[PDB]
């Protein structure tokens, strides 16, 4: 398998970091690789905010749910869906901005930010660094907008903790190929596959905690998806000037 | 510096393919790399449908807006935001599925699908193959759901055209670093950067068409984003059991 494939295949997210600062040469490579990725209609609907200042990064850590790894790492990247450039583009050509009144602008912005994050991940991890995305930036997103001074048509999607690792960690097992990859049409027989994966996941958790926790995949997923954990999501989009087509 | 960064740095979407079929060994590597990528709460909210049958793949091409490259390439991947596994997980633990009644489930599903599309992009491109994501899967989404037999809590995000290229094409220039990468806080002075970017994009389009087309970046973006081009987006999510918190 190629160095590119071995960077993706050997993926492990880390929460343990060193005092070692991320150099500007490393950051520029992470931003250039993220920009190099594909974007819907070459509109490049992703804005990246680099937070290195401890005080600001501490506020971001608390607003994401007091995650120790955010304040631990020297650099915290923030992937925002950006339609402000599309607004400047429309103003330059005396045209209105219609897309932001539909749910498509939300789907375009979120999908593009996921593409940019993964490119930033594969670039950073190939350099020897450790990454962990922070989807928790949508916990208190109105406070995130105020902090990062986000204008109209810009919304925070996910964060990304970039730093030098202190621990190698362990690869979390993934769902069986047959459960994720469906040939030609959708495969509805997935219950047995989820049951077999839960058995493998309970054994993984057991070996990870030294027989302290028996948490399977279905257990830990259903506990958080039991409710609407992030209520301020619609309030965040409606504040930035995004509307929907009922 | 390394093979992973090199694969991303020289990226280009391929729209001209050969009759050469994508092997099972290549497909399995692309799928395994996509699964190897990070997912919000390890929920793995991405489902991948492999379309290799010419007749089905032709229907998907015509629904995406007569995109020739879809019927030309031997494989047409389709990344779907999946909460049906989360529904099976909740049923196995006698728990309700609350997340789907909020906009967070839409943001999680779209961001995670973008990640999995990017992990497949770097894997396929490093193997020598050519790719082109299809955002056109959202043109007639209700027909896509019928075709792929997409159940409740499952929605099409973006397709991916994988095949053996017949031409190298060219790298599309990206926005100036200062316009996409903002240090500490958001930079509101982007108009001048877009204007300079339009001059460099008009020159790019002149050299690629041999002085036939003068299309700049802002003009291309203004025209499409002038309106809500995909109206069946909210009509797709709601049909698939997704609600919004008002
Ligand atoms: C969009 C997104 C959001 C995430 N948010 C968080 C988060 O708030 N906190 C955290 O510690 N990990 C977060 N993660 C990391 C996941 O928990 C992790 O990727 C998953 O458990 C898979 O494990 P692995 O990446 O270590 O192989 C997130 C991942 C993604 C892709
Ligand atoms: C989510 C997404 C959707 C896209 N949808 C389409 C599409 O419907 N048709 C198409 O030909 N290209 C589509 N593309 C490809 C873009 O036009 C292309 O990535 C962009 O012009 C940047 O150029 P490059 O990837 O060749 O460097 C899409 C890309 C992404 C990331």
TrEMBL record, chains A, B:
Residues 8-164 form the Nitroreductase domain. Belongs to the flavin oxidoreductase frp family. FMN binds at residues 11, 13, 15, 39, 67, 135-136, 172, 174. Signal peptide: none annotated. One of its GO terms (molecular function) is FMN reductase (NADPH) activity. This is NADPH-dependent oxidoreductase. Its EC number is 1.5.1.38. The gene is nfrA2. Keywords: Flavoprotein, FMN, NADP, Nucleotide-binding, Oxidoreductase. Coiled coil: none annotated. NCBIfam families: PRK10765.1 (NF008033). The keyword Flavoprotein applies. It comes from Priestia megaterium. Pfam families: Nitroreductase. It is an enzyme of class 1 (oxidoreductase).
